[PDB]
């Protein structure tokens, strides 16, 4: 329904990805909290930090793409 | 493609909702950090805590519905 639709799909895919990662992040953090042992805690903390960095970068992409799209919606 | 599909759609809708809320949560938290003024900070902190509670409850729903679904996938 337009060329703009391809950009809308990219923004949606980005949000869909951000959501998956945030759910994964909530699951890992709860596991970390509930864990009485050191070895697993420390491995999950490292997966968690990597996820935090990917989520930050994903969110920056969403904001730029939306921002770009709204500025195009003005013209 | 089945009666199970209605349950799959509910789980997807739940994840789609969880993702929206988590993006909203990341945007609010960044605003809070960047804010040099008290009044707005304090209003956003309260929206943020409410979002945290809704996200927790949403995630519990996803885990129970998935858990239920996997236990059904065994039989």
Residue numbers in the entry:
A (entry chain A), B (entry chain A): 32 to 106
Which sentences from the paper describe this structure?
Cep57 maintains centriole engagement for accurate centrosome biogenesis. Our work elucidates how human PCM protein Cep57 assembles into micron-sized biomolecular condensates through liquid–liquid phase separation by employing various tools in vitro. Both purified Cep57 and Cep57S undergo LLPS, driven by at least three interacting regions, including NTD, LMN motif, and CTD. Here, we demonstrate that a crucial centrosomal protein, Cep57, self-assembles through multivalent interactions.
To obtain atomic structure information on Cep57, we determined a crystal structure of the Cep57C at 2.10 Å resolution in the space group of P6422. The Cep57C adopts a helix–turn–helix fold, with one protomer in the asymmetric unit, forming a symmetric dimer. The ordered residues span from 354 to 428, with Helix 1 comprising residues 356 to 387, and Helix 2 comprising residues 391 to 427. The dimer interface is composed of two universally conserved F371 and F376 in Helix 1, whose benzyl rings pack well in a near 90-degree orientation with the centroid distance of 5.6 Å, a very stable π–π stacking interaction. Cep57C is also a dimer in 150 mM salt based on the analysis of SEC-MALS (size exclusion chromatography coupled with multiangle light scattering). To test whether dimerization is important for LLPS, we performed structure–function analyses by replacing F371 and F376 with Ala in Cep57C and Cep57S, referred to as Cep57C-FF and Cep57S-FF. SEC-MALS data showed that the size of Cep57C-FF mutant decreased to ~17 kDa, indicating it is a mixed population of dimer and monomer. Furthermore, the FF mutation reduced the thermal stability of Cep57C by 11.5 degrees, while the secondary structure remains similar to the wild-type Cep57C as monitored by circular dichroism. Compared with the wild-type Cep57S, the FF mutation decreased the condensate size, partition coefficient, and critical concentration for LLPS. Therefore, Cep57C dimerization is essential to promote Cep57 condensation.
